[PDB]
Design a protein around this nucleic acid. Sequence first.
RNA 1: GGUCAAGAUAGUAAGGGUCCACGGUGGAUGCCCUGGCGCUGGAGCCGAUGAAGGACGCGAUUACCUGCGAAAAGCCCCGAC
Length: 65
Amino acid sequence: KPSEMRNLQATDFAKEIDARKKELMELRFQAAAGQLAQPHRVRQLRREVAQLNTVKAELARKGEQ
RNA sequence: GGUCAAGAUAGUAAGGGUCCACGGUGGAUGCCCUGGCGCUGGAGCCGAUGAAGGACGCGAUUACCUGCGAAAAGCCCCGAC
């Protein structure tokens, strides 16, 4: 997040996936994850690079034409 | 009252039947927004920038279906609200 890459092409976000999506799969597990905690902070930030790879093949298509 | 007597013929009927009360899994009529028939008026497929429709596909479950399968209930934009 956010919609900040509406103006930034330079492969920095290239490893942005390595951020929270690295051990939130280690919170996506069964038990000791979040039942009464803040359960929602999983696939509520898993569209973290999804629906954001749009205008990424319809904007980032900027190669040379 | 009584000894004797037959004559006269009486109830129960284990079970049942003429009549009522209380009743079944089943169940139609009265009746119910979608589900069927005949129809007016319009519209009347997409097409290797690849279609009908299926198979196996996401939400702390997913199996008959909504969308979509991994960017699977949905994303540019303008817009309704």
